[PDB]
Design an enzyme around this catalytic site. Structure first.
Site, short mmCIF file in Angstrom:
data_model
loop_
_atom_site.label_atom_id
_atom_site.label_comp_id
_atom_site.label_asym_id
_atom_site.label_seq_id
_atom_site.Cartn_x
_atom_site.Cartn_y
_atom_site.Cartn_z
N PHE A 156 0.84 -1.19 0.00
CA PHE A 156 0.00 0.00 0.00
C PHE A 156 0.88 1.24 0.00
CE2 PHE A 156 -4.29 1.66 0.69
CZ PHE A 156 -4.03 2.96 1.05
N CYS A 157 0.49 2.23 -0.81
CA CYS A 157 1.20 3.50 -0.91
C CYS A 157 2.67 3.16 -1.11
CB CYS A 157 0.99 4.32 0.37
SG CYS A 157 1.83 5.92 0.37
N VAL A 158 3.54 3.69 -0.25
CA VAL A 158 4.96 3.35 -0.33
C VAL A 158 5.29 1.87 -0.11
CG1 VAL A 158 5.51 3.85 2.08
CG2 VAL A 158 7.24 4.22 0.30
N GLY B 298 3.95 -0.49 -1.53
CA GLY B 298 4.01 -1.10 -2.85
C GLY B 298 5.35 -0.90 -3.53
#
Ligand SMILES: CC(C)(COP(=O)(O)OP(=O)(O)OC[C@H]1O[C@@H](n2cnc3c(N)ncnc32)[C@H](O)[C@@H]1OP(=O)(O)O)[C@@H](O)C(=O)NCCC(=O)NCCS
Lengths: 388, 351
Positions: free
Chosen positions: A117-119, A121
């Site tokens: 998720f977000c960073v 990823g």
């Protein structure tokens, strides 16, 4: 109000492994039989992890563990003078690989489905590349929520990035400091607040007045800190230089990073009404996953926070899906099929055959080797940002 | 929305740079000698029921025999952009009180302040008692917030980033994700806390109303000092006219009403603001229910928990205007014949 321990993150679980950086959470099984292949969660480190586990209604962790998944999670620790010299290679080493090995030793299974998720990823995909360079068979599935693989064509973040500050931090790369949560809020949290408020007013214009989501704002206001080498590395190599589109332009953990190598089935989700980072930049990444055998893309209905987290028990808005993957995103949007209800169900199906057969849920949290330390949420999530 | 409602007669008896004093024509043979002043929000048109389109309340209380005055705030003009909160206290409430005490030849009066206007009155009180100025013998707060601890839904919006964003405003590919206080959101907050009717985003009043025309210093002061700092519950947090604000320095009887179903102003918050008026000789809180007829709840006990107040409250059907009429009648003096002239010789009635 909102207390982390009592009315939030109440999803029962135990801290089955702790690091100097992370805290792995094995969530207590709520079903009689679960899917054999576990499911690892890699939350972001910009803010705290519990966006996926807010309230039992909109708790994605409680939901997916309620579907029958062996749900594990990585809880990031706020920065501290002890971690002043941590880099991206440490978040890959003592972060992703540590929790992955821990899951392998607990469940005694070889593969696992992952989610970033977000960073998380970006950390996830870099860990997938270093995992394909050294023959480490850890993951058989990948999933990216509103994360950018192609950081060229970024969002409004570029309007608040100081080049001279990143360079001055590159001058003092050794013995780096700690990035205060105030600055990371200037670059991330404030913009997500603007998009959440704007999209809330829009949803109040379209449909009738809906209850305001104070839990989202509470997650957004609870900021953490980050080390200077890793954060400066993130701003320099991703949001400015963008070393993910050029194969080999970046090198960490003694490994060059090319995206084409990744041969893991990839599921990608991207919120449509995301004004801080338009979904075209996220969709501009699947064309660089040439080695992946399977690919999926899902358009999410609302913003970053509101669209990233849509509870299935509510089914508030729609999502768009189709298998085609042209070079132009509008061609994807035209030949896209709309589906009501939250998108999680779709990903659920996308995880049904990959998770293998079913196995009765392990009635023992942790294992004989990893004893449950303290119940969820744990200690790192309750950290407070450092004062000025 | 296809309204068929009565008009309330009234002439302008005093005018200045900021307000306009409206004396309502008496309709009773004998009226109570002590006058009654109405303090609306610092907005010309607030669209609150029973007041702005119809003004049924003033008509009713003049029917009960009261010398009713109203402080009609003038519309926003470019000459009013430099005023501050201390001007709304000074040239606003105190000037109107002087006009009333000169027209009626009566020294004190009963004060009524509803919505944001009530807050203004509150501050004015803390100035008057500090400067020995005796203007009011009692104050009444209708759907007003003194303790801004739980503002309600609007707390989801109000923060320093919003007020700072609007203070900035006042660039080729960037969206509204960098402009928080856009006219949409900002007008939603302003219209949401300053109007008795919430316009829809597709309404003309949503984008062009008096609340958006209010000078920015007032919005900054109200959003910061109250909805963010809650400077009222803390003694001496704000200084107005060179006076620290201490709620314990209010020495007049206090009546408070709050509608139960008003989701804008939680009646539990208005009730929460009562424990901070320790210096007031007596306090009366009455909860009003719309009835989807009308009814209200009275309780002379004042615990700290609002639900505990509601549990022991006695339900009286009808309009609560009877209850406030019985609370206000003894404090209104004797009965005198109605003045056949609105205003006076020195204060001729304007138009
Ligand atoms: C009255 C209130 C509860 C209405 O909520 P609601 O159920 O959505 O109804 P609406 O706002 O659509 O109003 C609908 C009805 O009110 C009437 N109405 C609205 N405003 C009115 C007014 N100022 N005077 C008379 N009638 C009014 C109409 O009858 C309309 O239709 P209906 O009778 O068929 O229902 C809400 O407007 C309110 O209470 N606002 C209070 C403002 C406030 O708290 N301000 C802070 C102090 S300024």
């Amino acid at each position: 109000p909102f207390q982390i321990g009592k009315n939030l993150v109440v999803t029962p679980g135990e801290v089955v492994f702790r690091n100097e950086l992370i805290e792995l959470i094995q969530y207590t099984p709520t079903t009689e039989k679960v899917h054999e292949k576990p499911l690892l969660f890699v939350p972001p480190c910009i803010n705290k992890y519990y966006l996926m586990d807010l309230q039992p209604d909109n708790s994605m962790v409680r939901h997916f563990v309620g579907q029958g998944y062996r749900v594990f999670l990585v809880s990031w620790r706020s920065a501290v003078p002890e971690m002043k010299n941590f880099t991206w290679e440490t978040y890959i080493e003592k972060g992703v690989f540590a929790a992955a090995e821990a899951v392998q030793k607990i469940t005694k299974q070889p593969t696992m489905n992952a989610l970033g998720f977000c960073v998380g990823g970006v950390i996830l995909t870099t860990a997938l590349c270093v995992a394909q360079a050294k023959g480490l068979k850890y993951f058989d599935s990948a999933t990216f929520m509103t994360s950018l693989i192609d950081h060229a064509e970024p969002g409004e973040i570029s309007f608040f990035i100081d080049e001279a500050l990143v360079a001055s931090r590159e001058a003092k790369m050794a013995a780096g400091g700690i990035i205060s949560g105030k600055e990371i809020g200037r670059t991330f949290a404030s913009l997500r607040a603007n998009d959440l408020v704007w999209n809330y007013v829009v949803n109040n214009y379209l449909l009738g007045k809906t209850p305001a989501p104070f839990d989202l704002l509470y997650w957004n206001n609870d900021a953490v800190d980050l080390p200077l080498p890793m954060h400066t590395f993130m701003l320099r190599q991703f949001y400015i230089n963008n070393a993910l589109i050029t194969p080999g332009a970046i090198t960490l953990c003694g490994v060059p990073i090319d995206i084409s190598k990744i041969d893991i089935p990839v599921y990608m989700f991207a919120a449509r009404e995301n004004h801080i980072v338009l979904w075209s930049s996220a969709y501009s990444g699947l064309k660089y996953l040439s080695g992946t055998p399977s690919r999926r893309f899902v358009l999410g209905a609302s913003g970053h926070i509101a669209g990233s987290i849509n509870p299935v028990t509510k089914d508030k808005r729609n999502y768009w899906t189709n298998e085609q993957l042209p070079v132009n995103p509008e061609e994807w949007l035209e030949g896209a099929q709309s589906h009501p209800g939250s998108w999680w169900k779709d990903w659920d199906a996308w995880l049904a055959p990959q998770s293998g057969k079913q196995v009765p849920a392990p009635k023992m949290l942790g294992s004989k080797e990893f004893p449950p330390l303290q119940p969820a949420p744990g200690s790192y999530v309750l950290a407070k940002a450092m004062p000025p």
